[PDB]
Design a protein around this ligand. Structure first.
Ligand SMILES: NC(=O)c1ccc[n+]([C@@H]2O[C@H](COP(=O)([O-])OP(=O)(O)OC[C@H]3O[C@@H](n4cnc5c(N)ncnc54)[C@H](O)[C@@H]3O)[C@@H](O)[C@H]2O)c1
Ligand SMILES: NC(=O)c1ccc[n+]([C@@H]2O[C@H](COP(=O)([O-])OP(=O)(O)OC[C@H]3O[C@@H](n4cnc5c(N)ncnc54)[C@H](O)[C@@H]3O)[C@@H](O)[C@H]2O)c1
Lengths: 233, 233
């Protein structure tokens, strides 16, 4: 299929090298030498694009979402942190009911969204804890320390970085039901995600220790799935 | 859409009551009073069926898989334990390459299959441990005891019950890479599933404590997804 990739950062260039595409349109405010892509200069959704993939920034999701939705394409979004904004979220799904498009929210850096999606109406609450090494926060500590705790909306305001995982989760069960905790642990070599889910159907715990590659393959699997006979999860 | 549900056990009757369907064809060796379904007597795939759902038994998967695949429908399978059979597995995906159909393997009683599907080529091994209460095995114990450990193929031969979770997993990463452990813990009130995944991309831990309802909603979410604009995981 022909596709439009928004953003040529670590994830964009990676999709271009691993993906199998006849044609690739790419838009990125910068202008680095483009390899096997048709670097656009003015954003737009070419008529032969069957799928659009956003992997730029929350602001990009907000800037083009409206236009993208006019077109009858599969719309893959990863910068979900943008949905932590009540006003933008309302606007988006409005355009979507009228839209001929289809939106896909791949799990990204976490997993367990298959069951969380199935039992979403029954979820009582979701606790997502991120444990980063002190170094990655310019901190020197002798023990674990909570650097933040509250809603997804607030977490995004102070951490314009991640807060994408929690947002996709919020988009599934409702934001009011998600609590975010960011912990700095001097004993931690790498980043970790722990998703604790309480519901009327059962309780689930998902621990993620990524050694972001996971998100890349998460996108690829979604694209591959569009054209596959064997679908898992 | 019009659908064909194979098996009217706990899961079949549940799909009939919660599902939203214009027409339902149902086949079940028994003959209990059927409510809102068109109880067939001779198995077959009516021409107006757009989706078939198996939730009967592994033997059923093996008996009708061949026929189902001739038809251009979405084929949902849950009794995956049947794929632990090397010979049947080879036969199935053979028919599928030639098939106009599409197969869906919902996560069922576990979760985390979204990430496991994305990073499947990189998986080094998967350990799935099931911790049941001694009572559910007619055992009286004073401490945890392993009642079984080995491959998915063997687990199915001694436990014609579950071994479906491990099979779907085997279908994803390859059976040789899955190790199954069934533990009886006197301290355990309910059943638990722990899926430990080791790979080149990272390590994942999924703990599942279901209070099977999860599988039902897992099927429903797959059906709902066929006709939805918002897809998660
Ligand atoms: N959902 C998840 O699990 C998950 C995980 C990791 C990253 N992400 C998201 O992916 C994004 C980062 O991707 P990356 O790793 O390639 O980072 P990156 O910063 O290396 O790449 C971003 C690229 O997009 C371009 N860009 C920024 N705004 C743009 C805009 N408004 N319009 C067009 N182009 C724009 C930038 O010039 C940059 O080259 C982040 O926004 C993050 O939220 C999501
Ligand atoms: N993948 C998962 O996570 C998962 C989880 C739970 C159960 N399951 C599967 O679901 C099945 C059980 O479903 P249930 O909970 O409704 O159980 P059940 O035993 O109550 O229902 C099974 C029904 O299917 C009928 N049946 C059996 N063989 C048939 C055949 N060959 N052809 C036509 N009909 C047949 C039976 O008469 C019975 O009424 C099991 O085979 C199990 O492997 C999968």
């Amino acid at each position: 299929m022909t596709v439009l990739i928004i953003g040529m950062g670590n994830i964009g260039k990676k999709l271009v090298e691993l993906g199998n595409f006849e044609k690739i349109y790419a838009y990125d405010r910068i202008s680095k030498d483009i390899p096997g892509v048709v670097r656009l200069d003015e954003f737009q959704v070419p008529s032969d694009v069957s799928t659009v993939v956003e992997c730029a920034s929350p602001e990009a999701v907000k800037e083009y979402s409206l236009q993208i939705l006019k077109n009858p394409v599969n719309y893959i979004i990863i910068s979900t942190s943008a949905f932590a904004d009540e006003v933008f979220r309302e606007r988006f799904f409005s355009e979507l009911k009228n839209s001929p498009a289809r939106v896909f929210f791949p799990s990204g850096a976490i997993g367990g969204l298959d069951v969380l999606s199935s039992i979403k109406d029954f979820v009582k609450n979701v606790r997502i804890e991120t444990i980063k090494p002190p170094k990655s926060l310019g901190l020197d500590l002798k023990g674990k320390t909570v650097v933040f705790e509250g809603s997804v909306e607030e977490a995004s305001k102070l951490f314009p970085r991640n807060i994408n995982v929690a947002s996709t989760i919020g988009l599934i069960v409702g934001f009011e039901k998600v609590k975010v905790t960011i912990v700095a642990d001097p004993a931690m070599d790498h980043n970790i995600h722990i998703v604790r889910i309480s519901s009327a159907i059962g309780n689930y715990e998902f621990k993620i220790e990524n050694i972001s590659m996971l998100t890349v393959y998460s996108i690829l699997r979604t694209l591959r799935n569009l054209e596959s006979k064997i679908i898992f999860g």
